[PDB]
Amino acid sequence: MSIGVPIKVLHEAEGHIVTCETNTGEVYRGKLIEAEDNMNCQMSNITVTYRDGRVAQLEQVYIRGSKIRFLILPDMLKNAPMLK
């Protein structure tokens, strides 16, 4: 009644591998450490692909939640009890 299911699913994703696509077209794939009720994601070991396609490595990343377009979650979360 207060906090939506997708935010709960994102909470479940902590500790797995996640790929993050911000409005600047930058793709961040790495281990999601923490997440809040907002999409503020603290995520680590980033393989980052820019718009041109350049790939870099960046060990610590904190993304503002307002600036996420979409988040791709691991498929085992499809079996989360919260997705039933």
Partner 1 sequence: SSKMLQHIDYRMRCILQDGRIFIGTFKAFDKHMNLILCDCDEFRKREEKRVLGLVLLRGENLVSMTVEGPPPK
Partner RNA sequence: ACUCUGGUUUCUCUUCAGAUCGCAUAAAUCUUUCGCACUAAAGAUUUCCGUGGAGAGGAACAACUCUGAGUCCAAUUUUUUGAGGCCUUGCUUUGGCAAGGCUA
Binding site for partner 1 (CB under 8 A): 4-7, 9-10, 23, 39, 65-66, 68-75, 77-78, 83
Radius of gyration of the chain (CA): 13
- Contact 4/25 with Cβ under 8 angstroms? no
Assess 69 for contact with RNA (CB under 7 A): no
Assess 51 for contact with RNA (CB under 7 A): yes
Give the shortest CB-47-to-RNA separation in angstroms. Answer: 19
- Tell me which stretch binds RNA (CB under 7 A): 13-21, 34-42, 54-62, 74-82: 34-42
Nearest-angstrom CA–CA distance, 63 and 11: 15
- Contact 80/12 with Cβ under 8 angstroms? yes
